[PDB]
């Protein structure tokens, strides 16, 4: 929604943001027709 | 009067980088440093060792 | 002020010139126009090139920090004029100096404009310098008589210079502006169709939205043209040890096999031509170019042996027939053509 703070008018529409790759049942992706796995990454946890 | 000198000891890396032939020194490490000093001095590699002749 | 960051260094330098007030802007703009008119008045009287005086006047304003003999000679020639004429030289000097200060005080305008064109193939400093070229042209074409602010007119020239430079310098293989804007329009049209369709538009759908004179064939050809070249140093794999150039074979230099079969063909042809006569073999060698490398026309061949054009055709064709007979009996040249 686009809001005009001065006028006070709201314009609402659904915009197409693209395509989200979908994970298959077994837990992989098909990227450009090729099966791919996103490997989990380990790193230092945030904090103090 | 003869030149008075004292012996020096350097590691293999420093000894290899101070060789007369600039081709073998440049092909080892510090290529920018080796070529910079060789070009200014106008060094002439006499192709004594093996690496120089391999390159050519 | 930054030894490392050039952008920060440039911003510091342009920050040392204060922004012009409206009164200061009008005064400088008036001087540039009066100086330009004064140079025109000087040239009509002194008789030399109007642009020649501008270079000489600008050289004095720029100073020794920026041919030297002819500039000084023209400078003395201008000063030899009477009092009324030397007045025009005075406005010319002040007009050129006002132009220098007017450009310097608007270097903040170009940076604000240029930062909106980043990520289009040119670095930020490249955008600023191109915008500076547009700013310089804006000063020359600006008219203060119209009472408009300088930034209103200058923004048009700063945007144009940056836009032109992107269309001319952002691609390794340069594409003309008329085709760059075609590519930009096609990309915009495809983007707008995607949001309406919820998917990648087809070439027919893009062509229909472009308008008359556009079909799917033209859209595909334009998109093929817009393809940027790929780097030979693009890494392959997780380690920077394999690159695209390592997998591209050279197809220009003949291979050792190709070079060898060329030599074998030459030695077989030279033995096949040995069975011919002396002049008869030389005719084929000169006709086909086996000596010089170019086909020699019948008239050129005829001049060498002192014969008419149709004479060669008799000996050239009869030599051809006998080589066919020899080949059928020996079978030594068939495999060299497949």
């Amino acid at each position: 929604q686009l809001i005009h703070k001065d006028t006070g008018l709201i314009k609402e529409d659904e915009v197409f943001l693209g395509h989200i790759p979908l994970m298959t049942e077994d837990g992989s992706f098909i990227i450009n027709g090729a099966d791919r796995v996103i490997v989990s990454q380990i790193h230092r946890s945030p904090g103090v | 009067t003869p030149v008075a000198w004292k012996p020096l000891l350097m590691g293999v890396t420093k000894s290899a980088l101070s060789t007369k032939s600039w081709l073998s020194a440049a092909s080892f490490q510090n290529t920018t440093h080796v070529l910079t000093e060789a070009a200014i001095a106008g060094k002439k590699d006499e192709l004594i060792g093996l690496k120089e002749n391999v390159i050519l | 002020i930054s030894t490392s960051d050039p952008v920060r260094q440039y911003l510091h330098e342009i920050g040392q010139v204060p922004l012009l007030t409206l009164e200061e802007e009008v005064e400088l703009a008036r001087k540039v126009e009066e100086g330009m008119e004064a140079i025109k008045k000087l040239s009509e009287i002194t008789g030399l090139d109007p642009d020649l005086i501008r270079e000489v006047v600008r050289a004095k304003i720029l100073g020794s920090a920026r041919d030297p003999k002819t500039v000084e000679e023209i400078d003395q020639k201008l000063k030899s004029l009477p009092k009324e004429h030397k007045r025009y030289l005075h406005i010319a000097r002040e007009g050129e100096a006002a132009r220098q200060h007017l450009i310097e005080a608007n270097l903040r305008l170009v940076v604000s404009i240029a930062k909106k064109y980043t990520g289009r193939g040119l670095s930020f400093l490249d955008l600023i310098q191109e915008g500076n070229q547009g700013l310089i042209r804006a000063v020359e074409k600006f008219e203060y008589k119209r009472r408009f602010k300088f930034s209103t007119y200058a923004t048009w020239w700063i945007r144009q210079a940056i836009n032109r430079a992107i269309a001319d310098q952002a691609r390794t293989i340069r594409i003309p502006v008329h085709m760059v804007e075609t590519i930009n329009k096609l990309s915009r049209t495809a983007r707008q169709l995607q949001q309406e369709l919820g998917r990648e538009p087809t070439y027919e759908e893009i062509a229909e939205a472009m308008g008359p004179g556009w079909d799917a064939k033209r859209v595909e050809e334009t998109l093929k043209i817009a393809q940027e070249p790929v780097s030979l140093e693009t890494p392959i794999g997780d380690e920077k040890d394999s690159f695209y150039g390592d997998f591209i074979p050279d197809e220009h230099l003949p291979s050792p096999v190709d070079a060898a079969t060329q030599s074998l063909l030459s030695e077989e042809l030279e033995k096949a031509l040995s069975k011919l006569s002396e002049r008869e073999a030389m005719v084929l060698k000169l006709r086909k170019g086996l000596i010089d490398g170019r086909e020699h026309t019948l008239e050129e061949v005829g001049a060498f042996f002192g014969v008419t054009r149709e004479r060669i055709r008799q000996i050239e064709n009869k030599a051809l027939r006998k080589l066919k007979y020899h080949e059928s009996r020996t079978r030594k040249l068939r495999d060299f053509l497949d």
């Binding site: - | 004292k6 012996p7 350097m10 590691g11 890396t13 | -």
Partner: protein, 103 residues
């Protein structure tokens, strides 16, 4: 100090982290241990050299022993450059070959 790193620092003529202390001249060592610090004096005919060894220094020489120039007063890896200036080219070459062989 052990294995491949020991070989590398010998071939690179690198100064050891826990370098030993060698006598610069020959003479007779004279130990003076106190509750505060340690100081070893190599007394000669007319020379009195000084070395301020730390408290936790494993000395390999006792009082009265005659030491040569370049001999290690304390245990540990000898700095090859110090040995060169103390005893000469032949000593350091002999030292380098033996130490590399030990590994």
């Amino acid at each position: 100090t052990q294995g491949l790193p020991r070989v590398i620092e010998l071939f690179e003529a690198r100064r050891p982290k826990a370098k030993a202390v060698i006598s610069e001249i020959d003479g007779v060592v004279r130990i003076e241990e106190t509750e505060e610090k340690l100081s070893v004096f190599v007394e000669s005919e007319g020379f009195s050299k000084e070395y301020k060894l730390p408290k936790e220094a494993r000395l390999l020489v006792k009082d009265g022993d005659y030491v040569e120039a370049g001999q290690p007063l304390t245990r540990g890896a000898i700095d090859p450059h110090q040995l060169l200036e103390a005893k000469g080219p032949e000593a350091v070459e002999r030292y380098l070959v033996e130490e590399i062989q030990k590994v």
